Design a protein around this ligand. Structure first.
Ligand SMILES: Nc1nc2c(ncn2[C@@H]2O[C@H](COP(=O)(O)OP(=O)(O)OP(=O)(O)O)[C@@H](O)[C@H]2O)c(=O)[nH]1
Ligand SMILES: Nc1nc2c(ncn2[C@@H]2O[C@H](COP(=O)(O)OP(=O)(O)OP(=O)(O)O)[C@@H](O)[C@H]2O)c(=O)[nH]1
Ligand SMILES: Nc1nc2c(ncn2[C@@H]2O[C@H](COP(=O)(O)OP(=O)(O)OP(=O)(O)O)[C@@H](O)[C@H]2O)c(=O)[nH]1
Ligand SMILES: [Mg+2]
Ligand SMILES: [Mg+2]
Ligand SMILES: [Mg+2]
Lengths: 149, 149, 149
């Protein structure tokens, strides 16, 4: 079943919103299949955010993301990539839709609560980057026969 | 005052989301005016979903909806039909707006939490189908003078 | 930092939704910087809503808003004016986006829970109208270094 990578960023951690964001993920039907609290080493940040190297926000991004722990996650569900993006909300939390994670919890574009893979793929690439698969559990859940036909 | 028919489907029942969905209905201002937990007999499913007889999802629909109890409801408020649809969200929960019932709780189009009448109507027709009106209470509520001019 | 004026109207007060609406404001990142429960004197209503004098809903507006206490607020954050409007939702709560204050809590256009300044601005003008600034506190909060770059 489709997987995506999600990351609760240091702003949500330092604002004590870990449970709230995880709740929004869970109640949507998405299955948490890997998850760990970790400090992000420099080299991981830079490879994760490689595609942003030329951009004005890059240095700030790398600093922010290495500034306190993140909660890294693998999340599984039909259409998981696009589902996650929909509940996370657009990149600028001031335009992110009310009811989305960024739309309800975030203020500014550079401190926007959570990251999700933007496609199949960068998902996966990001999953392989952050997780070895002995870290990724596989389990059936009671609700599954009720989420899906 | 306008009424509509709403139904909490077996997916929300089996996922233990009855109270959550009812809460979203109540806090919007809509008045619960009839409500019962019931197993849906075959013949009721088929007449309820009559308009879908030719369609690829039909057999799955009928099976799903008869597979565990539903919470059937009559709900009253100005513009109740269109209000309910707005908070329920579009049919595919992956596109349903965040903050909507389907947008927050549902994953797939065939397991989308709740049904609402799509017009004045089919409301109603559906109300008469599911409820005799000795089943439908009529009562004024303290908030009413505050919801409405 | 940008400020806006917000007001919890007598419908939310009389529906006991004060905490809920304040929660939605707080968790977005907005800083409550002035706030008071007050009955709105006639002359204040009329100057507040001056721009609506010719309109069909005017007399109803003035009556409603003077009919029970309101919770008047000054709220501070980057882009506070437009942020507040986004989480409050469009004027008619039947079209206001699910997940917004009006979209989740309001039914009708004339009883729509809360008011927010519509621009820099009328903010602000409304702040000066409702608050003397000995009423407006200024304080740094622990989350601030996490909301903002
Ligand atoms: N300070 C600042 N940061 C920005 C700006 N634009 C983008 N960013 C940051 O970089 C991201 C840009 O969005 P995307 O193209 O989806 O890539 P990404 O969002 O960095 O990836 P994730 O944040 O991990 O989801 C935002 O999350 C912000 O954290 C900006 O104009 N100013
Ligand atoms: N499996 C599956 N089910 C579908 C599909 N399209 C529609 N459905 C089901 O049939 C419904 C179609 O939407 P509508 O035209 O509003 O009618 P309806 O939604 O069945 O009516 P309610 O579900 O009771 O609101 C959805 O609720 C789904 O339960 C599909 O492509 N696949
Ligand atoms: N009864 C009734 N009231 C309306 C109607 N249109 C607007 N209103 C009221 O007047 C407001 C009109 O919207 P705006 O142009 O943003 O100004 P405003 O909303 O009054 O300002 P705030 O309510 O304080 O945010 C609504 O909040 C309603 O309270 C209407 O057609 N009928
Ligand atoms: Mg992004
Ligand atoms: Mg439907
Ligand atoms: Mg308005």
């Amino acid at each position: 079943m489709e997987r995506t990578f999600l990351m609760i960023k240091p702003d949500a951690v330092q604002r004590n919103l870990i449970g709230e964001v995880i709740s929004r993920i869970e109640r949507k039907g998405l299955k948490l299949v890997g998850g760990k609290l970790m400090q992000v080493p420099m080299e991981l940040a830079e490879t994760h955010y490689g595609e942003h190297q030329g951009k004005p926000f890059y240095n700030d991004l790398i600093s922010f993301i290495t500034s306190a722990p993140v909660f890294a996650m693998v999340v599984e569900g039909e259409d998981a990539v696009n589902v996650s993006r929909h509940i996370i909300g657009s990149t600028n939390p001031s335009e992110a839709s009310p009811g989305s994670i960024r739309g309800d919890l975030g203020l500014t574009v550079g401190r926007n609560i959570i990251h999700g893979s933007d496609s199949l793929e960068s998902a996966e690439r990001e999953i392989n980057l952050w997780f070895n698969e002995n870290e990724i559990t596989s389990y059936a859940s009671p609700r599954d026969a009720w989420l899906y036909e």
